[PDB]
UniProtKB/Swiss-Prot annotation, chains A, B:
Similarity comment: Belongs to the glutamate-gated ion channel (TC 1.A.10.1) family. GRIA2 subfamily.
Extracellular side of membrane: 117-258
Upper lineage: Eukaryota, Metazoa, Chordata, Craniata, Vertebrata
Location of this chain's protein in the cell: Cell membrane; Postsynaptic cell membrane; Postsynaptic density membrane
Organism listed in the record: Rattus norvegicus
Cited function: Ionotropic glutamate receptor that functions as a ligand-gated cation channel, gated by L-glutamate and glutamatergic agonists such as alpha-amino-3-hydroxy-5-methyl-4-isoxazolepropionic acid (AMPA), quisqualic acid, and kainic acid. L-glutamate acts as an excitatory neurotransmitter at many synapses in the central nervous system and plays an important role in fast excitatory synaptic transmission.
Subunit structure: Homotetramer or heterotetramer of pore-forming glutamate receptor subunits. Tetramers may be formed by the dimerization of dimers. May interact with MPP4. Forms a ternary complex with GRIP1 and CSPG4. Interacts with ATAD1 in an ATP-dependent manner. ATAD1-catalyzed ATP hydrolysis disrupts binding to ATAD1 and to GRIP1 and leads to AMPAR complex disassembly. Interacts with GRIP2. Interacts with GRIP1. Interacts with NSF via its C-terminus. Interacts with CACNG2, PICK1 and GRIP2. Interacts with GRIA1 and SYNDIG1. Part of a complex containing GRIA2, NSF and NAPA and/or NAPB.
Miscellaneous comment text of the record: The postsynaptic actions of L-glutamate are mediated by a variety of receptors that are named according to their selective agonists. This receptor binds AMPA (quisqualate) > L-glutamate > kainate.
Amino-acid positions noted as binding L-glutamate in the UniProt annotation, renumbered to this chain: P86, T88, R93, S139, T140, E190
The protein's name in its UniProt record: Glutamate receptor 2
Domain characteristics, as noted in the entry: The M4 transmembrane segment mediates tetramerization and is required for cell surface expression.
Modifications the protein undergoes after translation, according to the UniProt entry: Palmitoylated. Depalmitoylated upon L-glutamate stimulation. Ubiquitinated by RNF167, leading to its degradation.
Modified residues (Phosphoserine): S147, S181
């Protein structure tokens, strides 16, 4: 009867507390999604267990086997009852799992090491000196793969064939790549994460230009799940009550170090 | 067979063509939602008829009769099969009708006549010289009435008791009131509309401060409607292909006058 929640270690959504080793169960974690999970569980009246997705991925379908990985896969194959994480609502995912209305609004953005001569996606697309990539098994990579927009189509063509690979396994890896590239690598990631990192030491990265698109994160459940309806209404109530905005300020700027 | 679409005459979403009198059916109208309706119908494979909501309202439930008015009412009582308009996804509405994922992201904002000494909601709430209101039967009015947030609570207490009434019947009425008030009336409306009006002559209004909240517009259908699934997937596909961004640029800035 305990709801199995699949989530991912991605700051500031879900992070291990400093003293996590002395703690047990859900108490080991903290963050925006940890707080959200507690609120959702309270309003929907259920007990839960936070579990970190096995493969550390958000979710994409293997082109050859057609098997889903990441948190999406855990929902699709019955390993988890709900995903509470910064998981983007997309067409390909909506076809296999259900999503609540968005609890956060965002868009793809460009992260650069401060000083990098780039101000837009068009800039990145018209040069080669600065390499750029995105997160593997994430919605941004899939967005570029499917976009028929001239600029993004050109960017995808470059990224998919780039050697060495410009893709990374985790957001952390992408950020580290930007910071150690001395400005020779730009990273495409959602504005939420870009803005968070810009507020973290060593304060050497920044979001440049506007967002490339507009999308949202939603709480996901297996298609047809009974929890779906209640969770959706809970998200709408939490947003209207200002709770979601309070959580973003709490985890993004109240704890900012820049 | 033919899907009855309820919508509202709200520029630039739906407007009467200059020569509408000499045109038939759907050809009489133009605008963002007219363009969107054609695309949604094409992608979902259905024929449709655009109809303007009888009472010219978005939708609220009367406190005494418990009867829903506006486009929400048209769906609730079976007068329309779908609503394609700048209709905000809200908890109270989601309890009686279904909504697709957002096709537009926005938030409540403040419109002032240029020169008005107001920079935020906090400013409005602490003074009385400048009156302020919002749209009747709209989601913004409902937001303020249900808000437990100190500042918004104070603002509702004022608006609810202000005499003469600070509420208006249509967005156009609110804008006209701001323009003829010599700066003594501020208007609370969604950022989308605020931004649009900011681009229309005589270019005497502007949006000030940040948005008060974060929400979205969704395509609505009667609760449990069979059209729901297809329409939602169509919205996601159209957003991912940049169609929604193209439509906003088309109707907001390409046709801008300021
Ligand atoms: C977080 C996060 O931050 N940036 C990304 C990205 O895919 O660029 C993601 C993953 C994405 N929300 C998804 O694949 O659901
Ligand atoms: C448009 C529009 O622009 N501003 C508003 C508002 O309620 O402030 C609205 C109506 C609202 N989207 C709704 O009640 O659905
Ligand atoms: Zn709560
Ligand atoms: Zn006319
Ligand atoms: Zn199309
Ligand atoms: Zn066609």
């Amino acid at each position: 009867k305990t709801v199995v929640v699949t989530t991912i270690l991605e700051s500031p959504y879900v992070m291990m507390k400093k003293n996590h080793e002395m703690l047990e169960g859900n108490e080991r974690y903290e963050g925006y999604c940890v707080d959200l999970a507690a609120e959702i569980a309270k309003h929907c009246g259920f007990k839960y267990k936070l579990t970190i997705v096995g493969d550390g991925k958000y979710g994409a379908r293997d082109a050859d086997t057609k098997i889903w990985n990441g948190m999406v896969g855990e929902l699709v194959y019955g390993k988890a009852d709900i995903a509470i994480a910064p998981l983007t609502i997309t067409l390909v995912r909506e076809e296999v799992i259900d999503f609540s209305k968005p609890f956060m609004s965002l868009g793809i953005s460009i992260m650069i090491k401060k000083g990098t001569p780039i101000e837009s996606a068009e800039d990145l697309s018209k040069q080669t000196e600065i390499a750029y990539g995105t997160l593997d098994s994430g919605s941004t990579k899939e967005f570029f793969r499917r976009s028929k927009i001239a600029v993004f189509d050109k960017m995808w063509t470059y990224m998919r064939s780039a050697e060495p690979s410009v893709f990374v396994r985790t957001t952390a890896e992408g950020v580290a790549r930007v910071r150690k590239s001395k400005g020779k690598y730009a990273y495409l990631l959602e504005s939420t994460m870009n803005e968070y990192i810009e507020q973290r030491k060593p304060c050497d990265t920044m979001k440049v230009g506007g967002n490339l698109d507009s999308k949202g994160y939603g709480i996901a459940t297996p298609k047809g799940s009974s929890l779906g309806n209640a969770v959706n209404l809970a998200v709408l109530k939490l947003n209207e009550q200002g709770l979601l905005d309070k959580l973003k300020n709490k985890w993004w700027y109240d704890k900012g170090e820049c």
